[PDB]
């Protein structure tokens, strides 16, 4: 099988551009079409990113699972190859991502809308009077932090905190990301399906387990149980003044966990690269698409 | 338990909202209609 | 293209109890050709017992059924998701299993000893997706039933708890499960934290719904299910508190986000195998890596 789609530019390129696309070789690039040249409109997460103040992170998702994969092999003036990424094989996928997150053994990468800024992952092309920008593409975990953090500020718009909100904390460094205000319709539409859910959450949860961390509160200290301060809430006392009963908690967590399968894929946006054997030297990850 | 909502349009459904299923009522037609008839069943009173 | 793992390290025993498990599977620690007696399932996890890190093991390594055992060696075969295998359900807890349904490897839950090999070796449990969410159904309440009653006992009754937890039913199967009568407290038990999970999760769902849905609501009109699902719960747990402080509720946003994201993605079974063609006559089953 030959995977490579070479996309001529229609213009030159200038050897400082030549130059600052050459050091993104490797890096994960979304392409227009599957087929076998492309024209470089289409290319990167671009056209969907324009060049605004106001960005728009689940729409760049919604592109981004719609279009194909490709990674950066080889490119030169008037042309740029690159090499698909088609479920079924089995690729090298190089650590070529500046703010530097340190890959897990055979964990799972996650590519992502560009949440460092604009100007950080691109390459401006006055050339072809385009810009191509580069998709994030960071381990699973901090992916999720990524994602709630863009969610938990979103929601915190109309109560303001920020700088512990707005920058995400790894082990290597801990990095800012940018904050839009608003998502428009889409992430409310997002925020909307997560409401029902948690709504859902509300009603159907159990009470034993409450009745359990109740006394465990006032029996136990945890690492889980210090973010309540040792002051049970009031729902807890308002919910469990009632009983305890076996055969309406198996009920409740029988459409429970059905539930908490579906809420697992409502994180699941933007599709997801399982590794294995990242060597730490060479940086690179035997990759293929999960 | 009701809930609020400004608009749709044309369901196969029975119980669902459009501009189908939303009734045709003016207040300020109805109202002087009210008044003017109220008036007419005042003067109805009074013949007898 | 060559699969064969072949690891090197017995006697009439452990030839006995190695070759009545030729078609149980085992997961290693690297995708090569020798590696040594360590690698291999669940030895350096299973030994104090938990849940959430055996999963991860589980899900991180990669898997092997086995095939032949030496006087020496162990010739074994890992599974790639390209091709299909067979495997076979020699494992003390018995499940029968059908047609098509969906194969899961959860830890061993049901004793170190039931599924071991001791010379160390531990099979994972394998058994299929609907009796596997009923017994996590069904330990994870007993662990809170359990708890509840070991901190005050007029809550639940033992004989209460027993009679819809000691068994499970599924197509007619009624099996029976191995209860830790005695568990011990403050944790220590398998299972012990995954239950501290779940009722940290259910704790803060009302924090999270209330103000979810009012950060939502002045956001005018997305849908109508932004407030049409607000006549569904109870209003008790509506109108609960609605002042705390901005930072320690971020921070009981942010725990209950990344515990109900890991807890998500453990309820999603795991490592899923797809059957097609089992025979209880030979007790094998034709199965893929999904």
Redesign the interface.
């Given at each position: 099988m030959d995977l490579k789609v070479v996309v001529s530019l229609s213009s030159r390129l200038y050897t400082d551009e030549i130059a600052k696309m050459q050091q993104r070789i490797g890096c994960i690039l979304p392409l227009a079409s599957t087929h076998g040249t492309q024209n470089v409109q289409g290319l990167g997460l671009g056209q969907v990113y324009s060049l605004e103040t106001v960005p728009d992170y689940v729409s760049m998702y919604n592109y981004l699972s719609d279009c194909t994969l490709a990674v950066l092999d080889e490119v030169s003036v008037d042309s740029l190859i690159l090499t698909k990424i088609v479920p079924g094989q089995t690729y090298a996928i190089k650590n070529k991502y500046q703010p530097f997150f340190q890959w897990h053994?055979?964990?799972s990468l996650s590519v992502m809308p560009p949440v460092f800024g604009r100007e950080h992952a691109t390459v401006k092309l006055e050339s072809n009077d385009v810009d191509i920008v580069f998709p994030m593409v960071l381990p699973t975990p901090i992916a999720?932090?990524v994602l709630?953090?863009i969610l938990?500020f979103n929601?915190?718009s109309?109560?303001?905190?920020h700088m512990?909100?707005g920058s995400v904390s790894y082990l290597g460094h801990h990095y800012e990301l940018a904050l839009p205000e608003v998502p428009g319709?889409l992430g409310?539409?997002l925020?909307?399906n997560?409401?029902?859910y948690?709504?859902?959450?509300?009603?159907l949860?159990?009470r034993?387990?409450?009745?359990?961390?109740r006394?465990?509160i006032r029996?136990?200290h945890?690492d889980?149980?210090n973010?309540?301060?040792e002051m049970v809430?009031?729902?807890?006392a308002?919910?469990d003044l009632d009983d305890?009963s076996?055969?309406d908690?198996?009920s409740r967590?029988?459409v429970?966990?059905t539930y908490?399968?579906s809420?697992?894929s409502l994180?699941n946006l933007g599709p997801r690269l399982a590794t294995?054997?990242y060597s730490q030297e060479t940086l690179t990850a035997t990759c293929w698409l999960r | 338990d009701p809930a609020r909502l400004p608009r749709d349009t044309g369901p196969e459904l029975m119980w669902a909202p459009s501009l189908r299923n939303s009734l045709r009522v003016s207040p300020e037609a109805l109202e002087l209609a009210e008044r003017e008839a109220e008036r007419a069943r005042s003067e109805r009173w009074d013949r007898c």
């Open positions: 053994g055979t964990g999720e932090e709630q953090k938990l929601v915190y109309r109560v303001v905190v512990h909100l319709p409310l539409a925020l909307d997560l409401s029902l948690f709504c859902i959450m509300v009603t949860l159990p034993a387990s409450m009745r359990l961390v006394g465990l029996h136990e945890h889980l149980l973010l309540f301060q809430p009031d729902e807890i308002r919910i305890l076996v055969a908690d198996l967590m029988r429970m966990m908490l399968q809420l697992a994180f294995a054997a | -």
